[PDB]
Design a protein around this ligand. Structure first.
Ligand SMILES: Clc1ccc(-c2noc([C@@H]3CCCNC3)n2)cc1
Ligand SMILES: Clc1ccc(-c2noc([C@@H]3CCCNC3)n2)cc1
Ligand SMILES: [Ca+2]
Ligand SMILES: [Ca+2]
Ligand SMILES: [Ca+2]
Ligand SMILES: [Ca+2]
Lengths: 91, 90
């Protein structure tokens, strides 16, 4: 696959790694999302060490209001970290 | 670096590859967008060989109507292809 195709497949794969852990296998619960961030974005975001921060990220990301992060809502978080990293550097 | 972190980087890196060819270094014009789809999404989307298709895709992606695809707009594109792929893990 190209460098873009591989990247797209990795987003799918990572969302599935964390979402199939508990309950709804195709949505991220608070605990799943915290592990995803803490394990998989250590060089991009501060580790979450507080409940308040898990709560807040979920509230930001939860657009349909079910209290979970689904794949659409995950791709939106991906855009805002990727944009953050882009915003960061002068290119 | 994690797989996700690498995937995020590759997204910036492929955007920059194609956006820095012609004109505005930061933006994808139609011809840069068409070569990006055709060279880098060959396994996902149909090869573009019709101007009409170049135009429709750009019209679809361009939300500020400056006729180019900037980084935010390329991200919405990424998410829509990824989703039309995810529907395959259905
Ligand atoms: Cl769309 C979006 C989603 C999440 C964030 C976000 N959620 O947390 C943080 C930082 C990372 C490390 C913990 N503190 C805040 N950023 C920003 C935009
Ligand atoms: Cl923003 C965006 C991104 C990708 C598409 C797209 N590229 O191909 C398809 C079709 C429809 C969905 C599933 N089959 C391919 N859709 C449309 C808009
Ligand atoms: Ca789950
Ligand atoms: Ca939700
Ligand atoms: Ca350009
Ligand atoms: Ca634009």
């Amino acid at each position: 696959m190209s460098e873009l195709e591989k990247a797209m497949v990795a987003l799918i794969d990572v969302f599935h790694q964390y979402s199939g852990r508990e309950g709804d296998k195709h949505k991220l619960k608070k605990s799943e999302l915290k592990e995803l961030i803490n394990n998989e974005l250590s060089h991009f975001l501060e580790e979450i060490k507080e409940q308040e921060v898990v709560d807040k990220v979920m509230e930001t990301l939860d657009n349909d209001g079910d209290g979970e992060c689904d794949f659409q809502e995950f791709m939106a978080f991906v855009a805002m970290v990727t944009t953050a990293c882009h915003e960061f550097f002068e290119h």
